[PDB]
Design a protein that fits this description.
The complex is a heterotetramer.
Chain A (H helix, E strand, L loop, with lengths): L1 H28 L7 H36 L1 H13 L14 E2 L3 H29 L4 H26 L4
Chain B lengths: L1 H8 L3 E2 L24 H25 L1 H12 L3
Chain C lengths: L1 H11 L22 H9 L1 H7 L7 H58 L3 H24 L7 H28 L8
Helix pairs in contact in C: 2-3, 5-6
PDB class: transport protein
Keywords: Mvb12, ubiquitin
Assembly: tetrameric
């Protein structure tokens, strides 16, 4: 029936077009969403693995480092004991480091003292000179004591000289 | 100078030999420790999961359309 | 068409329309001479839009999407564990940090020794200080002696001044030597 | 002469007294005399420095110097009628 036939014909066209439009929408707004849906999951898989490893690394790293501490402390509590012990049953001297840092030999120690005495002798004569200028002592006194310290000096220099003469 | 030199030319010693304490221990410096962040990434997953879930629902809705039509198509042109 | 070019031109710079298989119909052959087909088309275009989905099934696609989902699920579970593990490490690290504070304590007391007393630089400093105190202690006694009328006092003065000086120079020369070394057989 | 190994510390191992029988009675007599002449030389340098510093007057000056100048003359003889040079020799 051309009538009933043409209507059915119209139905086909509306239906085919309605179908095209359906496919079009799905392919543009839905089927696209999976494009990089795998890459996403992939990226995440990559991340956990990394975190996982990092976690194991630090895990071990911290454990070993802890044993180093509980060990580095025993060799510390010990040495600190031996050091704080040396300061008891061993007179660590009056703060004068002089007693600690000494000459390599008794001979040398002697030399240091003679040298010191030599200078110290001048200083003393120098000072008494000043004392005379200030008027603290008369010329009479300065000469006597002066000649004495100057004399004791000649000896000290000869002494130093006789210990070092044999050295040519 | 002669004696002066000789004296200084020879090194001084520490009254106590090996009895004098020394720093035989070095400072053990602790290494740097960093634990990775997880919460941010954890949150970034929700939306990705949710996207999939909604697409799913969209497909069900879409795919369930033919049946809804048949039910209607029946009452309309049938018993 | 022109209406499609508009929908196209707007949204986000589209793509021109893409330039004929037939789709199975329901059972239209039984519908009224036309009054029903006509009514179905003219009044129920919406229904047809539903019907037509049958031929563009998303069953396969949804399956793939559903798999991707499960993985995200799992991925969320992996972090659920990676979190709990990282939780203990956040505590085991809480200990390696406190024990480290306990270490530095001991160490800072071991070092204290060799920096305030037994230390080479310390000793020297300690000595150099004592030396200065002597040079002045000498000068102090100098001025703190305006007059000496007592003959005996003189000798006492000279002996004391002479001694301080020797103690000074002795140490001064000691330092001179020290300034060319660390201190043998430490 | 000298010998190697920087252990020159050995050459000065023990203390050394001032005198040690190596020095004769006469040897000392010279040493003393020289020690006195040296003390008079130092003293005269300070006395002259005091005068030129107006710390003492012509009186004190002339007296003190004249005296020392005389004591020195005696000691200058206790070197002639008693004996390189002496010191450098006695020090070996």
């Amino acid at each position: 029936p051309t009538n009933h036939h043409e209507m059915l014909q119209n139905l086909q066209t509306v239906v085919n077009e309605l179908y095209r439009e359906d496919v079009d929408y799905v392919a543009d707004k839905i089927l696209t969403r999976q494009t990089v849906m795998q890459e996403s999951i992939a990226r995440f898989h990559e991340i956990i693995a990394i975190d996982k490893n990092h976690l194991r690394a630090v895990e071990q790293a911290i454990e070993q480092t802890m044993h180093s501490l509980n060990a580095q402390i025993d060799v510390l509590t010990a040495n600190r004991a031996k050091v704080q012990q040396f300061s008891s049953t061993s007179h660590v001297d009056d703060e004068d480091v002089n007693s600690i840092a000494v000459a390599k030999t008794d001979g040398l120690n002697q030399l240091y003292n003679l040298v010191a005495q030599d200078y110290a002798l001048t200083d003393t004569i120098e000072c008494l000179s000043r004392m005379l200028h200030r008027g603290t002592i008369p010329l009479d006194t300065f000469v006597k004591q002066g000649r004495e310290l100057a004399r004791q000096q000649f000896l000290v220099r000869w002494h130093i000289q006789r210990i070092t003469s044999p050295l040519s | 100078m002669n004696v002066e030199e000789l004296l200084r030319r020879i090194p001084l010693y520490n009254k106590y030999g090996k009895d004098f304490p020394q720093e035989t221990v070095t400072r053990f410096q602790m290494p740097e420790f960093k634990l990775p962040a997880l919460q941010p990434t954890r949150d970034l997953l929700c939306p990705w999961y949710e996207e999939c879930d909604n697409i799913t629902k969209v497909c069900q809705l879409h795919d369930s359309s033919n049946k809804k039509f048949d039910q209607w198509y029946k009452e309309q042109y049938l018993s | 068409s022109r209406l499609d070019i508009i929908r196209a031109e707007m949204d986000v710079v589209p793509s021109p329309g893409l330039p004929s298989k037939n789709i199975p119909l329901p059972e239209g052959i039984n519908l009224l001479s036309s009054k029903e087909i006509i009514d179905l088309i003219q009044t129920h275009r919406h229904q047809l839009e539903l019907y037509v989905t049958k031929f563009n099934p998303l069953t396969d696609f949804a399956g793939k999407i559903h798999a991707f989902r499960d993985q995200f699920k799992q991925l969320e579970e992996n972090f659920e564990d990676l979190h709990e593990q990282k939780d203990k490490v956040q505590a085991l690290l809480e200990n390696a940090r406190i024990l480290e504070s306990k270490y530095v304590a001991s160490w800072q007391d071991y070092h204290s020794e060799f920096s305030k007393k037994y230390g080479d630089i310390a000793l020297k400093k300690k000595l150099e200080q004592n030396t200065k105190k002597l040079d002045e202690e000498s000068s102090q006694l100098e001025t703190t002696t305006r007059s000496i009328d007592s003959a005996d006092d003189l000798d006492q003065f000279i002996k004391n001044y002479l001694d301080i000086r020797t103690q000074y120079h002795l140490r001064r020369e000691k330092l001179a030597t020290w300034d060319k070394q660390g201190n043998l057989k430490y | 002469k000298l010998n190697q190994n920087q252990d020159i510390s050995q050459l000065f191992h023990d203390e050394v007294p001032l005198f040690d029988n190596s020095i004769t009675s006469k040897d000392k007599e010279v040493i003393e005399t020289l020690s006195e002449i040296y003390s008079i030389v130092i003293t005269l340098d300070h006395v002259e420095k005091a005068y030129l510093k107006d710390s003492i007057d012509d009186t004190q000056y002339t007296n003190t110097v004249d005296k020392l100048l005389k004591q020195f003359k005696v000691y200058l003889n206790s070197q002639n009628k008693e004996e390189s040079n002496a010191i450098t020799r006695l020090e070996r």
